[PDB]
């Protein structure tokens, strides 16, 4: 899994080397940054339900056809609405993992790999998840570097969906 | 490979759960103990050549059969490969120390290693001895109170000792 | 050339990726560490001549046969002594580059690559340069993290000579 | 590839010289300006998809011949490759911004690129236009005063603009 | 370009062989089938405008949000409506090429390669084009083997969009 | 790989024999039934996406544990690979239908597949279920009386069902 | 084994594709051609003994040294004559397989692969088998497309022996 | 590579156009003339060995310098390579005949071939002669009225002659 | 691989010993017998084609089931591979004769060969028979008193016979 | 070209090595052997015409059909007889080259490479050339090690023709 | 690559000729002079390290700009590569001496070497100087009257000098 | 292991060939040379102890710091002196193996491979072993071709240490 620490090791191991300052500095930056990342991860976790709930409605608001069109891909039934909120929760939970891990690894591994295939196979619009993510970005209530951290991983997901 | 942080994330995902307050606290302590970990890695790495060579010398002094003709550590190619292995093990152990998890060591180094030595005729018990020597040296160097801001690194030394013991167990 | 910054880019470019926090954190650690590295680089530069001079004598002291045996590999002639001090200067100057660059790149590129071949071809003992380097380490007059930085690159050279 | 720091070291080594006080001072300023550089890279990277897609849309609106049948940007494969190139260029420009030197861009991206477009029949002047659009967007995003500690980033924006212009020059 | 004829040659040339009955039979099947394919290609060409026009409305009907949501990806403006009909024309025209060429080559080359990237980059739903294609399939007015031919290439496009 | 015709030739060669009148007759019937076989292959292939996706949806509805965190069909990579496998199996089954022999399926798809799933922790019984769903869908689509010259395809549907059952047996 | 059907599948499978009209057309050509191929295969089978017998004598006639020179490679002994007729039977039987299979596969697999090595090792002249094959071609009594089919595989063997 | 049909489609796409009635008619004639084309390909292919060997023999009889020591066709390796080239050219010409377009020949065979012969010292004019011999033989065999349903194949023979001349031009 | 001389050196090194007078004497005899060894190798090699082909013919005469349809030596590909194997074995045996040690044969030829034949369905006992035939022929040719300086080669013929028997044992 | 000397160099150069006794010994064996090889080469050259003439008749004798059957492959015409004798001369001349060069290189390069293709394309029996070569072997009039040398290269050709 | 003997054979074959008495005589002299050639090769090879290192030292003493910072022989990697090249050239020259022909040197070493140095910025004239130094040393060592059966090797030394001059010409 | 014989076989086997004169000549040169090599091997073996003893002192003489400096790498203790003489014995014994085997194989395999790593790791100067080897070369008491043989392998070791 891709983290600043595993990337530092991978770089050394690729060349059959022991680790050097060239690599310990990277890891130190990670350790220093963790204070801001952990604030963000905690706040997003603590406020996850209201973020998810808010995000779901933001989607339904922008794309009201998703609440009305017939189809298992849509949130026009209770089961569909439950799957949509689950998915949004997945996204948010992955953001929190990225923050805890200090890198994109968890999202890359658990969510991004396979994403386009899954979205195309199950007829899910990327634009739906982007709206959800834009809501979370807008309303997470973080400021300063904690917000920079959260937004970096949220925008990473948005970019993966574009 | 995983690191102390990804390890926790991976366990959490398997359950489909957000992190608990307890887990954040644990991981915050890890970050708070980070400087010590960087010193250890630096120190062991900065002395890698002497750790290996002194451990090799000590091994061959205690087990001269390894370097007598007909042995495994006899001939320069076999000697070179032996020293190399000691270097490799020390290397992966230092990765493990940085990561705060053994998955890199286990995965990329330790798995299949017993079977490999068994196929070659290399006595695993001897390798384990070399590992233990490197361990004692690595720890003395890493935990040396001279030239560093005083504090307690004991927990970390035990973790470090754990990676070395793990490696020695894998071959013995 | 291997620096925290070029290693961050190389990692991204290897995978056809744009740069992510996973990489910006590494570079930030580099930028933070630079304060200590630059102190060290400056002090070693300012005191280079006395360090070199001291280091040369430390060698001659430990290995007095180097000042007496006949041979162009030895420092038994004025030209030999000049080449020895030049070489020591090279080592020290490379340390300062490593500190400025924030990684092993300069030493790897300009000095370590080819080192064993050159030493064996010209009959130069690695143990000579190690002694020189141990002198510099002992007497650079740095304390705190500036000393940690200088010593990391000095020991790196020692390891390359072992 | 080189970075602002290795660039200086490389020049110094060629002369066989230690760094001067002036060079340390320069490089210390670079480090002092580092946060701004990280914000720029983050911001441009965080908006990479929209920068590209909005620049593509603007290009094809201004030059509809590119997407008319028989063109170069016509068919999905050719469209995909075009968008890809815009993504690639933006990518290498962001590397350059992080490094504070163009060698990665020049080397790994820009060299042979004119000749490549000339061989394919891709109009370089059009690519240059797309690059300039991305530039204007990238800079507006990077230099946006909202949501960031106020200060002056003007020097950096000019440097950034320089990488974009360099890339546009290389193909035009 | 992939046609029964180029696939026959490619198979022979891959093995450094001259062509054998094993390959001439394939090409004969192509020549025999061409009667049905050419009927289909002609009818679809002759009726292209009404098919395109009908197909466009079928989309707007099923997905009325496409005629109302603001965005250059939507057909909520005259220019958007023109681009949508152009695209549908592209699809239909490719079907006719596939029929003329006797294989998927033209569609593979001109339309399918890059398709997911283009759709995701410009925020176009595959489901839109599928509906258009289902309309064309339903209303092309072909029967017998001419319809089997047209539908094989239309469904091929549908599969490529899933 | 073999086809219904090469299969017969291969058996004949092993005996060193020319074909008997009975074998020619058999093979002539195969040729006489060829149109039906082409319709089946066309129809199943023409609906491959829906067959897979509807069978996947039905599987996960009946076995929600597969898509709960900690499962095998959980995460997009694992989901993607699962859908892929269903696509792959359907693909090889359609090859088999065209050839009128399973050797392509057996050889290129089915062999080592049980052991592969056992190594990964993928429940074979679940895969078998997905295969059976695809079977029922494939057959309904292939044997649909609408839009085709009427006749009896029953023998062929049973053969087709046979390839699907074979595949399901190979993993279950 | 190379048949129109296995070549169609191989082409699809090589690219990880399902089969398309591009491939079903080839197979249809095979199915249509089978009527002529099966006529030919049947007639050659029914008349195999007289063809073989005639072919053997045609060889002995053109190359009478084969009936007189001493050597196990020659047909100067009863055992040699039996081996020669067996071999000719092999050739004819392979032709019939090619016709039944609708391609060169059987002949390629069972007879052509290894052919030059076997002929050179056992001192058998290709020109002998060519004469046998020319006799079969001349005297098979097929007309129309049944003859085109038989001759395509007979000439294929002749080409393999040149 | 393209075939007569894909050639037309490719031209049409470049213009963004549907096929005209005139183009359908043209292509329908191609299909109507298909049997003749299959006979030609069959016949030339069925006699490939004799066409080559008789053309080689005729070449060396007319140009004995090629097989005198110190020549290009002297030694078995050089002879083998020469015969091979004649086989290769005939092969690509037959592909071209099947496809009804030269792109396979041009692309996969003819391009760089002059430069290749010029680099080796192989006289292109001699190769052209061999090609012309094969042409005359190929055409006599393909257009032989014996053993085939009578009709006129003249247009096709001229097309065929065209591929041979094209190949001869490419090296001469 | 080793040769009679390296074999001795390798044994000596394992003990850490210089050669004894006895070993020098042994090895001097080897050198003194060298001409005979070169004649054997030459003679067997110079007749390799007939040795193989005559042994093949004799095998198939004694075991006609091998060349009856459905056999292992039936079809030209299987025949070719069989003759090839006989050529290969003879080849490695001749290497062994030159070297005066079997390590090349054992290593590069004989190891895994039984398991290989068992996997294919090739009857090892039949291969052994072919080897023995080649042995009897090889020895008669190598030890033929005509056209060579008279002396006794008996020891060498027994050694040679030993390599053949070894090979036959390895498959039987 | 394969000679003891070029094989010695190739072995060294393959490993990036300078030449060692391991290689100079091989070359010395070559130099010592050259005395016998050069005797053989000279005698075969001096007696080439009578050997060729004798060899040609030996063939015609064993295979009299070669002097009577119609065909450009046969020696049934003056031109055919001239080509046959030329070819035999080629073989003999190659033997002499092998002896001069001290290895198989010349024969490998000028004659063996392409041999089976040429023989099969022009319908020439290997058995013809073997008989010619057996005549030369029988009647070269060399004894001792000069004969061992000549026969080694003659049998090498025979093996290449089997 | 060719050797003095194959060189003659190759010329003869081009003419289609048997060797003349004169050519046999020439080649017999070559064989008669063989011992001297083996001594030369042995001697130069046996002293390869000192020849190179002494020639390098002499070069850098005469051209100190090569080892001043910013030069081509400055840094250990560039030094290593330079020494390597001197080793490589000496190596190929010794091959040439053994073979009695330059084709190995020319082919495998000398061709493209000027262009290679020109692309790198390595001064060819300096390389030529190093080659000449090695030449003078190689010849003094090879032609040293001590410890060898007396005779005249003058012709051979001139040939040897020729290979060195050839190499120096190729880069200068 | 690299010997003239194994190199001859390796060359043949690399090309899937049987052995030819091109290779038997090499081996004959080996067999002829063995007389000189075996004289040398015997004399060096018989006189090994005095050679080793003499060689050890030659080193201590040229590099007297090796008998006085503290360090397990030096011969300043009885154990160090014992290891030094052992090593010299190793070198001499390898020379004798090279002579017996007729090539560099034993030395390459048992001693040269790993040599630089071992020397650098244990801080042993190549120049020490070179002096030892130069003593052995000077004082082995061989003349003629026996001396050429011994010196070829001794200088080979010297070259490997440079
Ligand atoms: C290019 C690929 C290709 C296809 C797809 C093809 C189909 C094809 N199927 C046909 C007939 C048919 N097709 C079917 C097939 C069916 N009816 C049923 O409900 C059966 C179970 C179902 C099979 C699923 C039947 C029963 C016939 C009429 C008899 C026959 O042709 O064998 C015919 C004869 C004309 C016609 O009947 O319409 C054609 C050309 N030919 C081709 O060359």
**Rounded Cα gap, residues C118 and A72, in angstroms:** 72
H helix runs in F47-75, sequence order? 48-62
Residue J122: HSE in the Cβ half-sphere, 13 Å Cα cutoff: 25
**Rounded Cα gap, residues C49 and G159, in angstroms:** 85
**Rounded Cα gap, residues G162 and B75, in angstroms:** 59
Kindly give the number of the ligand 1 atom that is closest to the alpha carbon of E144: 38
Q: Are F116 and A152 a contacting pair, CB within 8 Å?
A: no
Phi and psi at J143, nearest 5°, equal: -130, 170
**Rounded Cα gap, residues L128 and L151, in angstroms:** 18
Using a CB-CB cut-off of 8 Å, the residues of chain D touching E117 are 76, 80, 83-84
The CATH number for D172's domain is 1.10.490.20
Using a CB-CB cut-off of 8 Å, the residues of chain F touching B15 are 69-70
| Residue F42 CB less than 6 A away from ligand 1 | yes
**What is the separation of C-alpha E108 from the centre of its chain, rounded to a whole number of angstroms?**
9
Q: Are G4 and G34 a contacting pair, CB within 8 Å?
A: no
For residue I50, give every residue at least 6 positions away whose Cβ sits within 8 Å of its Cβ, in sequence order, or none: I137, J162
**Rounded Cα gap, residues L125 and L134, in angstroms:** 15
Task: Tell which of F9, F24, F33 to mutate to test the G interface (max G CBs under 10 Å).
Answer: F9
User: Quick one: tokens of I111?
Assistant: 């190891």
**Rounded Cα gap, residues H153 and H160, in angstroms:** 10
User: Quick one: tokens of F36?
Assistant: 């039906």
User: Quick one: tokens of D92?
Assistant: 């290498």
Per-position b or e across L115-139, b if 16+ CB within 10 A of its CB: bbbbbbbbbbbbbbbbbbbbbbbee
| Structure-solving method | X-ray
Shortest CA distance to I91 belongs to which of L86, C1, J159, A136?
A: J159
User: Quick one: tokens of A46?
Assistant: 């603590």
Resolution (A): 3.1
Judge residue F149's burial from the number of C-beta atoms within 10 Å of its C-beta, 0-12 exposed, 13-18 middle, 19 or more buried: exposed
Residue F4: HSE in the Cβ half-sphere, 13 Å Cα cutoff: 21
User: Quick one: tokens of I171?
Assistant: 């498959």
Give whole-number Cα distances, H153 to F59, H34, H38, H101, H134, in Å.
60, 11, 11, 17, 19
**How do the domains of chain A map onto residue ranges?**
1-162
Give the chain L residue nearest J21 (alpha carbons).
L103
User: Quick one: tokens of D169?
Assistant: 């020059």
Q: Are D93 and D103 a contacting pair, CB within 8 Å?
A: no
Beta strands in chain E (DSSP E): none
Tokens 């510099």 map to which residue?
C136
**Rounded Cα gap, residues A137 and F44, in angstroms:** 45
B65 and chain I in contact, CB less than 8 A: no
Determine whether the interchain pair J155/I53 forms a contact, defined as Cβ–Cβ distance below 8 Å: no
Sort residue K146 into left (φ over 0), alpha (ψ -120 to 50) or beta. beta
**Rounded Cα gap, residues L25 and G44, in angstroms:** 58
Shortest CA distance to G37 belongs to which of G139, G141, G148?
A: G148
**Rounded Cα gap, residues E127 and E146, in angstroms:** 26
Query: Does residue C27 sit in helix, strand or coil?
Result: helix
**Rounded Cα gap, residues E68 and E81, in angstroms:** 11
**How far off is chain K from L155, nearest CA to CA, in Å?**
5
Give whole-number Cα distances, A51 to A55, A77, F141, G150, in Å.
6, 21, 44, 76
Domain count, chain K: 1
Per-position b or e across G79-117, b if 16+ CB within 10 A of its CB: ebbebbbebbbbbbbbbbbbbbbbbbbbbbbbbbbbbbb
Domain that holds residue I11: 1-172
Give the chain J residue nearest I52 (alpha carbons).
J162
B12 and chain A in contact, CB less than 8 A: yes
Task: Tell which of I9, I37, I45, I49 to mutate to test the J interface (max J CBs under 10 Å).
Answer: I49
**How far off is chain G from J115, nearest CA to CA, in Å?**
12
L3 and chain K in contact, CB less than 8 A: no
**Rounded Cα gap, residues G103 and E25, in angstroms:** 9
Q: What angle do CA C18, C22, C28 make, to 5 degrees?
A: 105
User: Quick one: tokens of H65?
Assistant: 């310098």
Using a CB-CB cut-off of 8 Å, the residues of chain L touching I1 are 1, 6, 9-10
E87 and chain G in contact, CB less than 8 A: no
For residue H24, give every residue at least 6 positions away whose Cβ sits within 8 Å of its Cβ, in sequence order, or none: E38, E41, E42, E100
Query: Does residue D36 sit in helix, strand or coil?
Result: helix
Residue C95: HSE in the Cβ half-sphere, 13 Å Cα cutoff: 35
Mutate to test the pocket of ligand 1, among G27, G28, G29, G33 (most ligand atoms within 8 A of CB): G28
Judge residue B102's burial from the number of C-beta atoms within 10 Å of its C-beta, 0-12 exposed, 13-18 middle, 19 or more buried: buried
Give whole-number Cα distances, A118 to A72, A92, A121, F122, G18, in Å.
14, 18, 5, 19, 20
**Rounded Cα gap, residues L89 and L50, in angstroms:** 11
DSSP F110: I
Query: Does residue I30 sit in helix, strand or coil?
Result: helix
Phi and psi at C35, nearest 5°, equal: -65, -45
| Residue G24 CB less than 6 A away from ligand 1 | yes
A 87-116 residues inside an 8 A Cβ radius of B: 93, 96-97, 100-102, 105-106, 110
Greatest C-alpha distance within chain E:
59
User: Quick one: tokens of I7?
Assistant: 């074999």
Q: Are B18 and A48 a contacting pair, CB within 8 Å?
A: yes
Give the chain J residue nearest I48 (alpha carbons).
J159
Q: Which of A18, A38, A101 lies nearest to residue B91, judging by beta carbons?
A: A18
F69 and chain B in contact, CB less than 8 A: yes
Tally of CB atoms within 10 A around F115: 9
Q: Are F83 and F52 a contacting pair, CB within 8 Å?
A: yes
Q: Are I137 and I55 a contacting pair, CB within 8 Å?
A: yes
Shortest CA distance to H86 belongs to which of H125, H55, H122?
A: H55
DSSP C106: H
End-to-end CA distance of chain F: 24
Give the chain C residue nearest A29 (alpha carbons).
C29
**Rounded Cα gap, residues J95 and J51, in angstroms:** 13
Phi and psi at J157, nearest 5°, equal: -60, -40
Shortest CA distance to H13 belongs to which of E101, E51, D126, D61?
A: E101
Tally of CB atoms within 10 A around B17: 13
User: Quick one: tokens of A102?
Assistant: 């200090």
CA of F30 to the centre of ligand 1 (A): 13
Q: What angle do CA L6, L7, L10 make, to 5 degrees?
A: 85
Tally of CB atoms within 10 A around A107: 25
H helix runs in chain H, sequence order? 4-15, 21-32, 34-46, 48-62, 76-99, 103-105, 113-120, 124-142, 154-171
User: Quick one: tokens of D165?
Assistant: 């212009």
DSSP I20: P
| Residue F39 CB less than 6 A away from ligand 1 | yes
Shortest CA distance to G95 belongs to which of G31, G49, G37, G32?
A: G37
Sort residue L102 into left (φ over 0), alpha (ψ -120 to 50) or beta. left
CA of F155 to the centre of ligand 1 (A): 14
For residue C160, give every residue at least 6 positions away whose Cβ sits within 8 Å of its Cβ, in sequence order, or none: C107, C112, C115
Q: Are I81 and I56 a contacting pair, CB within 8 Å?
A: no
Q: Are G95 and G110 a contacting pair, CB within 8 Å?
A: no
Shortest CA distance to I88 belongs to which of I48, I61, I118, I119?
A: I48
DSSP J102: T
CATH architecture of G1-162: Orthogonal Bundle (1.10)
User: Quick one: tokens of D24?
Assistant: 């340390």
What long-range pairs does A67-74 form, CB within 8 A, spacing at least 24? A71/A123, A72/F57, A73/A122, A73/A123, A73/A124
Phi and psi at D85, nearest 5°, equal: -55, -40
The per-residue DSSP string of I79-124 comes to: HHHHHHHHHHHHHHHHHHHHHTSSHHHIIIIITTHHHHHHHHT--H
Phi and psi at K117, nearest 5°, equal: -60, -40
User: Quick one: tokens of G42?
Assistant: 């049947």
């Amino acid at each position: 899994m891709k983290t600043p620490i595993t990337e530092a090791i991978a770089a050394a191991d690729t060349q059959g080397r022991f680790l050097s300052n060239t690599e310990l500095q990277a890891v130190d930056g990670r350790f220093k940054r963790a204070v801001a990342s952990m604030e963000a991860a905690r706040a997003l976790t603590n406020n996850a339900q209201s973020l998810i709930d808010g995000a779901a409605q933001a989607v339904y608001q922008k794309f009201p056809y998703t609440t009305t069109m017939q189809g298992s891909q849509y949130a026009s039934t209770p089961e569909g609405k439950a799957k949509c909120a689950r998915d949004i929760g997945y996204y948010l939970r992955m953001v929190t993992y990225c923050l805890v891990a200090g890198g994109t690894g968890p999202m890359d591994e658990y969510l991004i790999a396979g994403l386009s295939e899954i979205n195309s196979t199950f007829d899910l619009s990327p634009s739906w998840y982007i709206e959800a993510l834009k809501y979370i970005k807008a309303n997470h209530g973080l400021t300063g570097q904690a917000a920079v951290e959260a937004n970096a991983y949220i925008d990473y997901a948005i970019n993966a969906l574009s | 490979m995983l690191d102390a942080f990804a390890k926790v994330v991976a366990q959490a995902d398997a359950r489909g759960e957000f992190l608990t307050n307890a887990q954040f606290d644990a991981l915050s302590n890890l970050v708070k103990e980070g400087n010590k970990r960087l010193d250890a890695v630096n120190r062991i790495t900065s002395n890698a050549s002497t750790i290996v060579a002194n451990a090799a010398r000590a091994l061959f002094a205690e087990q001269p059969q390894l370097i007598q003709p007909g042995g495994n550590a006899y001939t320069n190619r076999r000697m070179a490969a032996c020293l190399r292995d000691m270097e490799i093990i020390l290397r992966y152990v230092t990765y493990a120390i940085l990561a705060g998890d053994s998955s890199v060591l286990d995965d990329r180094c330790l798995n299949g290693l017993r079977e490999t030595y068994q196929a070659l005729g290399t006595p695993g018990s001897s390798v384990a001895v070399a590992i233990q020597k490197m361990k004692d040296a690595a720890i003395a160097i890493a935990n040396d109170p001279n030239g560093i801001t005083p504090g307690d690194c004991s927990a970390l030394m035990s973790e470090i000792a754990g990676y070395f013991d793990r490696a020695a167990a894998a071959v013995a």
